[PDB]
Each structure stands twice: as structure tokens, then as C-alpha cells.
Design an enzyme around this catalytic site. Structure first.
Site, short mmCIF file in Angstrom:
data_model
loop_
_atom_site.label_atom_id
_atom_site.label_comp_id
_atom_site.label_asym_id
_atom_site.label_seq_id
_atom_site.Cartn_x
_atom_site.Cartn_y
_atom_site.Cartn_z
CD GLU A 53 -22.23 2.11 -5.36
OE1 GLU A 53 -23.28 2.66 -4.96
OE2 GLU A 53 -22.17 0.88 -5.61
CD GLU A 57 -22.17 -3.51 -9.29
OE1 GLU A 57 -22.38 -2.74 -10.26
OE2 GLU A 57 -22.97 -3.62 -8.34
#
Ligand SMILES: OC[C@H]1O[C@@H](O[C@H]2[C@H](O)[C@@H](O)[C@H](O)O[C@@H]2CO)[C@H](O)[C@@H](O)[C@@H]1O
Ligand SMILES: [Ca+2]
Ligand SMILES: [Ca+2]
Ligand SMILES: [Ca+2]
Ligand SMILES: [Ca+2]
Length: 234
Positions: A53, A57
Site C-alpha cells: 500500500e 492522507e
């Protein structure tokens, strides 16, 4: 069974390497997470398989920056590398073009075409296999990470004007684009699930397609709607 509703937009397909760009105005309030990330679906399963991943964010308490991350290792034993990067104007105050470049050798993060981070080797060598492009809006139970959740700030909306996906071949060749005049169900899926540490249920009810934009909403459960006006991307 949770008390809040968030949303997740994800590509039905996964890719091995590439460049991914999204023009977005992020959402932010103490306690929220507004994102763009590459994800190898199934990574969350603790059956021995690897975790793959790459993240962007925006943490609610700090709208003037975003956290970059690469998650490798395996469920229950993740290897991470969180870093922070300033965004101006604030991520929730203007549209910016967020980019992720991923090859066998490096992962690069860009904001409006400019590099804010480039990581090589180590974790990058373990980002094997494929990853799909995703975007979600939720709230973390970890107040230390995102701040205490201020429910009075709901509803919150993350706006995506367009997305570009390039194939790894510059080292990239444009593969497809979506300007979001409509929700293309042959390209995208809407998440309907949750995970530990997430105060919300990601629901297809909070993915909207309005005025050339894909909108992700974070609302109290039972108040899933968008009736306002989409912001301008001048
Ligand atoms: O929890 C089951 C759910 O997981 C989804 O992946 C999550 C993962 O659980 C979470 O740990 C990570 O931080 O984010 C990803 C993407 O939201 C998975 O995509 C779902 O299919 C699954 O039902
Ligand atoms: Ca609260
Ligand atoms: Ca193509
Ligand atoms: Ca779904
Ligand atoms: Ca558009």
C-alpha cells in the site's frame, strides 16, 4: 453497525506500477482522514500474504499538510514510513493535483507537479504485485493521529474533479482518464465495509456524482446526502 457513514471510491482493476493523478479538494475536521492511495486488495488478511500500500492522507486536525506513507510487511506486522508535507493553500481550501508514481525502483509523491517525497529501495522492493487506485473519507479512533472527532463539523465532502492513470513504460504513458461527468461502473467500485480503528462504515450511499465531480461524503448515519453546490476549480 457503526454510527457514521464514510465512503470509498476504488478502481475495479489493479495495476503493476504506473503514475496516478487526481485533482481534488480534500475534507478536514479534527478526527478525519481524507485520502488517495494505492492498495493491493486483500492485504488486510492475516494469512501470511504481504501488505502492499502507498498513501496520501490528509489528517483532519492538520488541513495544511498531508501524510505520505508506504506500508509493507504483513497484517499484524506492518513496516511503515510516515512523513508529512505542507500543502498551500490548505488541502480543504483549494483544489490540488495529487500524484503518485510507482516503479520497481521508487515511489514518488507530487503536489501540483512538484516532488515532495521520493523513496527508493527497502520498502519499495517489497511493493510487489498489483495495486488499485483508491480514495476514501473516514474518521480514525486514534485521536493522537487525527485529533478528537468533532461531529459538529459533519457533513464533510471530498471533491474529485478528474483522475488520470498512466501505464509504466518520461517513464509513463497515459492509459485512461475520468472527468467524472458520471459514475462509470465499469471502471469504479464503491466501498461497503469497514475495519478496526475506523469509526465509520464506508458506504456506497455516500459516493455522489454531481456537476462534473465525484464527491465522497462523511456524515452521521441516517443523514447521508449531498444537496449543496460543488466548489469551483478555477
Ligand atoms: O476490513 C475488511 C475490508 O478491508 C478493506 O481494506 C482496508 C483494510 O481493511 C484497512 O486495514 C486498510 O487500512 O484500508 C483498506 C482499504 O479501505 C478491503 O478493501 C475490503 O475488501 C474488506 O472488506
Ligand atoms: Ca467527538
Ligand atoms: Ca487505455
Ligand atoms: Ca460496493
Ligand atoms: Ca470534472
Amino acid at each position: 453497525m457503526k454510527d457514521f457513514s464514510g465512503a470509498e471510491l476504488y478502481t475495479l482493476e489493479e495495476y503493476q506500477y504506473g503514475k496516478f493523478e487526481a485533482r481534488m479538494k480534500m475534507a478536514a475536521a479534527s478526527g478525519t482522514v481524507s485520502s488517495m492511495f494505492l492498495y493491493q486488495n486483500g492485504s488486510e488478511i492475516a494469512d501470511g500474504r504481504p501488505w502492499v500500500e502507498v498513501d496520501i492522507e490528509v489528517l483532519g486536525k492538520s488541513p495544511g499538510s498531508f501524510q505520505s506513507n508506504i506500508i509493507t510487511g504483513k497484517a499484524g506486522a506492518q513496516k511503515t514510513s510516515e512523513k508529512h508535507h505542507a500543502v498551500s493553500p490548505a488541502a480543504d481550501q483549494a483544489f490540488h493535483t495529487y500524484g503518485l508514481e510507482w516503479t520497481p525502483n521508487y515511489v514518488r509523491w507530487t503536489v501540483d507537479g512538484q516532488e515532495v517525497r521520493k523513496t527508493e529501495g527497502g520498502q519499495v522492493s517489497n511493493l510487489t504485485g498489483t495495486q488499485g487506485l483508491r480514495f476514501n473519507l473516514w474518521s480514525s479512533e486514534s485521536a493522537a493521529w487525527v485529533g478528537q472527532f468533532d461531529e459538529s463539523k459533519l457533513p464533510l465532502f471530498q471533491f474529485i474533479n478528474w483522475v488520470k492513470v498512466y501505464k509504466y513504460t518520461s517513464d509513463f504513458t497515459l492509459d485512461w482518464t475520468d472527468n467524472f461527468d458520471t459514475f462509470d461502473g465499469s471502471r469504479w467500485g464503491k466501498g461497503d465495509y469497514t475495519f478496526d480503528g475506523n469509526r465509520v462504515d464506508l458506504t456506497d450511499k455516500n459516493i455522489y456524482s454531481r456537476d462534473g465531480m465525484l464527491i465522497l461524503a462523511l456524515t452521521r448515519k441516517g443523514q447521508e446526502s449531498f444537496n449543496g453546490q460543488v466548489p469551483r476549480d478555477d
